[PDB]
């Protein structure tokens, strides 16, 4: 079934360990030109919430400890918030490279 794959994804979440330092799925991405052009697109509350989560992850990795078990971000509490902007940025850059091909 798919519950073995969901258990493997939960085990990969807890083995990647960026649920330990208060982060969701899209705070850990490499900020290239596409991720920066998508990171400008968010509303101000989500942008400041992402920057507070990044600052708390930087602070607690500097102090070398982690959040507790209640303060960890769960897999069901994970929101893929950057994905409807990043899919639009990736599709727009694909259309731009298609017009550069033409």
């Amino acid at each position: 079934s798919s519950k073995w794959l969901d258990g493997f994804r939960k085990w990969y979440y807890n083995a990647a360990g960026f649920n330990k330092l208060g982060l969701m799925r899209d705070d850990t991405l490499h900020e290239t030109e596409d991720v920066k052009e998508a990171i400008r697109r968010l509303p101000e509350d989500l942008y400041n919430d992402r920057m507070f989560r990044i600052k708390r992850a930087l602070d607690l990795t500097m102090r070398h400890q982690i959040l507790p078990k209640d303060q960890w971000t769960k897999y069901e509490e994970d929101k893929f918030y950057l994905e409807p902007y990043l899919k639009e940025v990736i599709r727009e850059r694909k259309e731009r490279e298609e017009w550069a091909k033409k």
Binding site: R40, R41, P43
Partner: protein, 420 residues
Amino acid sequence: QPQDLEFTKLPNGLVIASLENYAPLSRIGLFVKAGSRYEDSNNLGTSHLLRLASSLTTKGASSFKITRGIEAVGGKLSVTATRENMAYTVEGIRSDIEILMEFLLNVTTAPEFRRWEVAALRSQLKIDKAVAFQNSQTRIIENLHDVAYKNALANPLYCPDYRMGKITSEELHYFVQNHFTSARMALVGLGVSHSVLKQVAEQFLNMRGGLGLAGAKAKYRGGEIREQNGDNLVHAAIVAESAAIGNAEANAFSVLQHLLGAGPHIKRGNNTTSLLSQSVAKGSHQPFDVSAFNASYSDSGLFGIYTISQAAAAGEVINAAYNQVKAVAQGNLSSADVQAAKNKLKAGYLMSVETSEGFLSEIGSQALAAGSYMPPSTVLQQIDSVADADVVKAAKKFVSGKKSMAASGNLGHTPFLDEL
């Protein structure tokens, strides 16, 4: 080969129109009746951002796709912002009319209005206003319309200084979802036949049916905004309420406007037999520029006197021009000059007719105002039916109406409504 201007109304309430000129340039103009007069004080200046939002991301066509598509097909997409009604005109190559027409349809009927593109366009609003206000006259006309109406025509056509940084995507979507309606707008075409225009109107245009807010009747206010600018030339304009488009007095007010003179006919000439430039130059040796000013809308028009002068003798040119209109309000006029005014108005209407951009604007304005086309020969007949006493009645209505004044420059000798 120009057989007829086909003109019919779709049963939702849409005007569709097309003319086959067998023209190598195809010009399709959409004409919404949502200018800068249909918003209120809460949504001020969003018509400027909707005017600048021709190249944003739409549904089914991106911003990069729409910019590369319009200027790689070859034509233009541009707007026209009269305070009553707005126009989205597109000109282009006749071989590929369809991509341009669906591109303007995706501009109008299904926008997206993304927040980051509006935040990018907020600086372009300030840049477009700071370039467009280098003309001194449009500030006077904007202050004139701010003075001479109470609400629902007193909103400025350009955006105010504070709303740049405040106009939201929810505000633009509310303005589009209320006031961009198929029962409200029209779609006219030059060089394009009726069949593909009716197919596009059935395809992507006949969705909206809710007419939205219809305005608030544009009540007259009257007063003065008199700012100072530091230029040597004062720009002043004294204006009263006149009749609306479709009445029996707007033609007489336009005959009176071309009787007092509004056009530089002989370029770098005296503009001699116009009555205002006659009666100012009888008394003043100063450099000046005096003209009439007719601003006709669908609710109540605005007829007035425009003076540009040096600031040391503003009272002489303003009082001489107003004494000329007080002279013509008593019937002191010649019927040969009324015939010259009528021929100047017929010439000015055919100047509006003769270019296909101007023909597209005239067909769109007649389509939004009336819903049926009126031929220019009947326009010449209606101008020729203006009596000699009707412009005396129009000057009497201008004198007896409540005044309104917009002026800017050094204001040491500029007179007031008590002195006029």
